[PDB]
Design a binder for this molecule. Structure first.
Ligand SMILES: N[C@@H](CC(=O)O)C(=O)O
Ligand code: NA
Ligand code: NA
Ligand code: NA
Length: 415
């Protein structure tokens, strides 16, 4: 009865209820001097949610990359394909840069200080560039999976899928039969892990409630100030991206901006209430039918840019890195900021596109800068911004969908 009714309730609405309750409980308990009780009674619930998220990282990465690499067997570059790919990367790269400016004009987390364990954060010297590049190739494919190395796993997974499609269409019947069996076994593992992800998200409202309550109880009132600044900074950057970038480009080629906004309102509203680019993809394709765009051209750009042209996610990754860096009390050099731009844009493609996937890929750019998740101080900062992702997930989704439609219009105008 009670357990059943908890199941069919919307997950996005369920998470919002937990976040609101967590903030209210944390402030009340912290004000009465009960911050010690929450650290020993509700914190384990938050830690369990973090541990569950880390388990799904590797089996998804290895299985999905092998299937994806073997899926795209042909290598064809159309005349209109190069036009849309170069636009996608340029917008993604500039979106990160705009987020850096917003992350610098407003300080996300300069005021807050983290002293977990009584030891301040100490940065470590980065390895030489030559050594980093050579570590991509693994000396043991099984060792990389067991030792928790992500970069060697990606390189081996991609080449394994490419090797499969070469012998999948060979002249030997026995070789062909073995190729399908191996691919099907790997494909089944990828599908199974997606089901576990759905079950994990049902526990998210409990996990988010514990994380928010623990943060607010130990330190509150003031912490809301930094959380408001980072939330406003992302939205300010996103609304600037829509107006300063897309509107200017449309005016250059003569597209009427007011007509585009009125015609694309259905796609923008659908993305906000769903927060899934893949889920709102049928809506986006329906809108393009009335635009006068040729059938062939838009049917290739919108599916392609759905998981590759997420401009809002790239801006979110750049801003969130500065908030964590300021929280630890360290500073980012000019060389490190350029590194973030390269890492952030790559993480944009790697994001699956499902709600909450952007926060998962945020750890990737943190390791490149020099902020491993194994550090307890870094883990506390990451887990604190992890809870508030639901508020900042909807805003960047609309920007992701908006960039897809305007890219097709520009390339279609110039054929
Ligand atoms: N909100 C993103 C997904 C994500 O950020 O993980 C999208 O809908 O494209
Ligand atoms: Na882009
Ligand atoms: Na997109
Ligand atoms: Na992506």
């Amino acid at each position: 009865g009670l357990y059943r009714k908890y199941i069919e309730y919307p997950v996005l609405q369920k998470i919002l209820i937990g976040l609101i309750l967590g903030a209210i409980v944390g402030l009340i308990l912290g004000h009465y001097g009960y911050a010690h009780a929450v650290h020993t009674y509700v914190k384990p619930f938050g830690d369990l949610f973090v541990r569950l998220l880390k388990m799904l990282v590797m089996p998804i990465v290895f299985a999905s990359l092998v299937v994806g690499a073997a899926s795209i067997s042909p290598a064809r570059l159309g005349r209109v394909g190069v036009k849309i790919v170069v636009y996608y990367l340029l917008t993604s790269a500039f979106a990160v840069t705009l987020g850096i400016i917003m992350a610098r004009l407003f300080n996300p987390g300069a005021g807050i200080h983290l002293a977990v364990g009584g030891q301040q954060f100490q940065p470590h010297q980065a390895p030489p560039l030559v050594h980093i590049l050579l570590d991509i190739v693994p000396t043991n494919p099984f060792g990389a999976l067991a030792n928790g190395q992500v970069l060697p796993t990606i390189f081996f997974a991609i080449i394994l899928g490419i090797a499969i499609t070469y012998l999948m269409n060979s002249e030997n019947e026995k070789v062909r039969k073995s190729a399908e069996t191996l691919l099907d076994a790997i494909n089944g593992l990828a599908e199974a892990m997606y089901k576990i992800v759905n079950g994990v998200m049902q526990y998210a409202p409990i996990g988010v409630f514990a994380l928010i309550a623990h943060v607010m109880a130990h330190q509150g009132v003031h912490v809301v100030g930094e959380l408001a600044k980072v939330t406003a900074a992302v939205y300010v950057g996103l609304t600037l991206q829509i107006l300063l970038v897309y509107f200017v480009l449309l005016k250059i080629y003569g597209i009427d901006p007011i007509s585009f906004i009125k015609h694309a309102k259905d796609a923008m509203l659908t993305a906000f209430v769903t927060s899934s680019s893949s889920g709102t993809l049928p809506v986006t394709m329906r809108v393009a039918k009335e635009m006068g765009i040729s059938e062939g051209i838009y049917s290739f750009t919108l599916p392609l840019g759905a998981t590759i042209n997420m401009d809002g996610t790239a801006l979110y990754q750049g801003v969130a890195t500065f908030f964590i860096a300021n929280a630890l009390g360290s500073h980012l050099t000019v060389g490190q900021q350029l590194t973030i731009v390269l890492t952030a844009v790559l993480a944009s493609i790697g994001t699956a596109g499902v709600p909450g996937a952007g926060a998962i890929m945020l750890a990737m750019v943190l390791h490149s800068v020099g902020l491993p998740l194994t550090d307890p101080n870094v883990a506390a900062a990451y887990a604190c911004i992890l809870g508030i992702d639901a508020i900042l997930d909807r805003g960047r989704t609309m920007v992701n969908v908006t960039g897809d439609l305007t890219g097709t219009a520009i390339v279609a105008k110039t054929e």
